[PDB]
């Protein structure tokens, strides 16, 4: 019953591959639904065409700022930043999908994919999904990041939507 979404990733415009996610709507429905709707574009805006702007190898890949493309923007489907739904799920290893934020109850559209266990984020960032297929594509993306997070090539969501 949990929805599945995919991202088709490109690197300087050239296709790299597809990453799919399971979204834990059974445990965090409002946060899963936000990400699901932004991935389909059904509200008129969303992740299609946006970039991963901050990639730190061994740590995480961050994206979802589809309004300012650099970490300062993005918006949820609710007309306002929304609350931390719960912290039931933990940052247990590579593939965990988690909401970026600017402090308590400031969720918008930015998210990150963990490429390692990041337990210091538990209780601060809402975990809402996990990579199902294509972790190797996230690993290929990671190689275009750097110590300060700057990417050495443009890492884009060339297409996205809901599977199954």
Q: Which residues are CB-contacts of 32 (< 8 A; sequence separation ≥ 6)? A: 2, 3, 23, 24, 25, 128, 129
Q: Catalytic site residue 70?
A: no
Residues 146 and 129: their CA atoms lie apart, in Å, by 25
Q: Which single residue is written with the structure tokens 């999908």?
A: 97
Q: Is 136 a catalytic residue?
A: no
Per DSSP bridges, beta strands 111-114 and 60-63 are antiparallel
Phi-psi region of 89 (alpha: psi -120 to 50; beta: other; left: phi over 0): beta
Q: Resolution of the experimental model in angstroms, please?
A: 1.7
Token pair 């932004």 is found at 38
Task: Please compute Rg for the chain using Cα positions.
Answer: 14
In the chain, DSSP assigns E strands to: 4-11, 14-23, 52-56, 60-63, 96-99, 111-114, 127-133, 155-163
Q: Residue 10's closest CA among 155, 161, 160, 150?
A: 155
Phi, psi torsion values for 126, nearest 5 degrees: -80, 115
Distance CA 18, CA 9 (A): 6
d(CA 109, CA 76): 5
CA dihedral defined by 43, 88, 135, 154, rounded to 10 degrees?
50
Candidate list 36, 125, 128, 144, residue with the active-site label: 125
**Contacts with 12 (C-beta within 8 Å, 6 or more apart), sequence order:** 153, 154
Residue 125 corresponds to which tokens in the numbers above? 């960032």
Six-digit token pair at 157? 């969501």
The catalytic position among 23, 52, 121, 128 is 121
**Token pair of 139, please?**
């690993």
> In this structure, what token pair is assigned to residue 122?
């538990």
End-to-end CA distance of the chain: 10
Say how many residues make up the chain. 164
| Method used experimentally | X-ray
Q: Which of 21, 35, 101, 110 is catalytic?
A: 101
Catalytic site includes residue 101: yes
Catalytic residue selected from 66, 111, 112, 144: 112
- The catalytically annotated residue of 54, 66, 89, 128 is 54
Q: Which domains does the chain have, with CATH numbers?
A: 1-164 (2.40.100.10)
């Amino acid at each position: 019953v949990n929805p599945t979404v995919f991202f088709d990733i490109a690197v300087d415009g050239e296709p790299l591959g597809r990453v799919s996610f399971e979204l834990f709507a059974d445990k965090v429905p409002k946060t899963a639904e936000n990400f699901r709707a932004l991935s389909t574009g059904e509200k008129g805006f969303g992740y299609k065409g946006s970039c991963f702007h901050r990639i730190i190898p061994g740590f995480m890949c961050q994206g979802g700022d589809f309004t300012r493309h650099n970490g300062t923007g993005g918006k949820s489907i609710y007309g306002e930043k929304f609350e931390d739904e719960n912290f039931i799920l933990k940052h247990t290893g590579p593939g965990i999908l988690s909401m970026a934020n600017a402090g308590p109850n400031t969720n918008g559209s930015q998210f990150f994919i963990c490429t390692a266990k990041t337990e210091w984020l538990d209780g601060k960032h809402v975990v809402f999904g996990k990579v199902k297929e294509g972790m190797n594509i996230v690993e290929a993306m990671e190689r275009f990041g750097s110590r300060n997070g700057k990417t050495s090539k443009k890492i884009t969501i060339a297409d996205c939507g809901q599977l199954e």
